[PDB]
Amino acid sequence: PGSVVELLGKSYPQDDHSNLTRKVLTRVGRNLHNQQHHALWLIKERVKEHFYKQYVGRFGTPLFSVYDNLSPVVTTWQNFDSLLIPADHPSRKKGDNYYLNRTHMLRAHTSAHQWDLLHAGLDAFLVVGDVYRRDQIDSQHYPIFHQLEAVRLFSKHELFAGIKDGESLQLFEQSSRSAHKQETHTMEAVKLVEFDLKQTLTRLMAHLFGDELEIRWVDCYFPFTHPSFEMEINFHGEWLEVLGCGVMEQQLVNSAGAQDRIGWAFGLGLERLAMILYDIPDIRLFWCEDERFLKQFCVSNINQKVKFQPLSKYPAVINDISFWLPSENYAENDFYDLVRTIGGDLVEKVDLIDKFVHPKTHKTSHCYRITYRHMERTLSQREVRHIHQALQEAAVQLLGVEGRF
Ligand SMILES: N[C@@H](Cc1ccccc1)C(=O)O
């Protein structure tokens, strides 16, 4: 019926957590980040060259070994617990992740590999991979996107190698956790690690854009780094975040067996960066086959500056859909998964526009506005109407909604 999922050779029995769609599974193994002459592959290769050629360390440049072919199938221990993410944390919700079952999932971030690669004794590495998230539908969100993770560890004498009294300064102490440092980190060590992290990323961004770009650092929170930041780029008059980063939580680094090391880590969104770097308006464009988009990244070398040229934009068709919710058996993201399945890359966005409760029946009603717009052509009213009608019938069959229309 709907038991057992088979993926990349292996078999995953379904259960109460399982919520993959066939549609999302058809994207696993595509590995756009590894597809020669794809925009995302291009960014990856330029980041690789920056760390192989331009990073500089007081000892030597750390060798950043590159892992761009790790399977996206991970345990919840890799994806969450290894990163100190609490058991009650909202990032674990079934509404937000693609679970194969209670124990295996599609990784929601490339940070799901930090512990394993630290555990193998690496001091510096890059991880590049497709990641998976259940979320809303708009031009900035897609069920699969791509991240590049970097981790860089320091020994005590390496970090203090430029100073005249180095072997009396230390990495570790026992004090209190502040806005600026972890409880077991010295302020001396954190200031140097933070400086190296931000200098590295600032130079990487100048390597990718130019020297005129406006960036800012925004303090934020992650369970697996502290202090932590998001880097934001000002683009089309708006500050857009492109990465998260910070000083790695020492419990994580210690638990992987690197107890004599302090580190930084960052994770950048390749689509978010690519959309700024090349002015790409819609994330669906990374997945189309229109040569008008694809050929622009086929360049002679990975440093030939591609000057992406805008595509024509086609008119939209807007249709509403209203139904009564099942009696306490419904998630917004379930409907978005269904729209992706039926509507696919015809759908530009979905907004929940209205909700209310009916007193006589106690039923909740949702109304969603669906914006149909194709990236490659004009849609006819007719094909959209039939697709929209098919969506309504699938919604009744599969989600147990009650058509209100
Ligand atoms: N994993 C974070 C990014 C990040 C990576 C490494 C350190 C800190 C933050 C995300 O997906 O948003």
Numbering used by the authors: 11 to 415
Question: Which sentences did the original study use to describe this structure?
Answer:
Mutations in the mitochondrial aminoacyl‐tRNA synthetases (mtaaRSs) can cause profound clinical presentations, and have manifested as diseases with very selective tissue specificity. Among the recently reported pathogenic variants are point mutations in FARS2 gene, encoding the human mitochondrial PheRS. How clinical manifestations of these mutations relate to the changes in three‐dimensional structures and kinetic characteristics remains unclear, although impaired aminoacylation has been proposed as possible etiology of diseases.
Here, we report four crystal structures of HsmtPheRS mutants, and extensive MD simulations for wild‐type and nine mutants to reveal the structural changes on dynamic trajectories of HsmtPheRS. Using steady‐state kinetic measurements of phenylalanine activation and tRNAPhe aminoacylation, we gained insight into the structural and kinetic effects of mitochondrial disease‐related mutations in FARS2 gene.
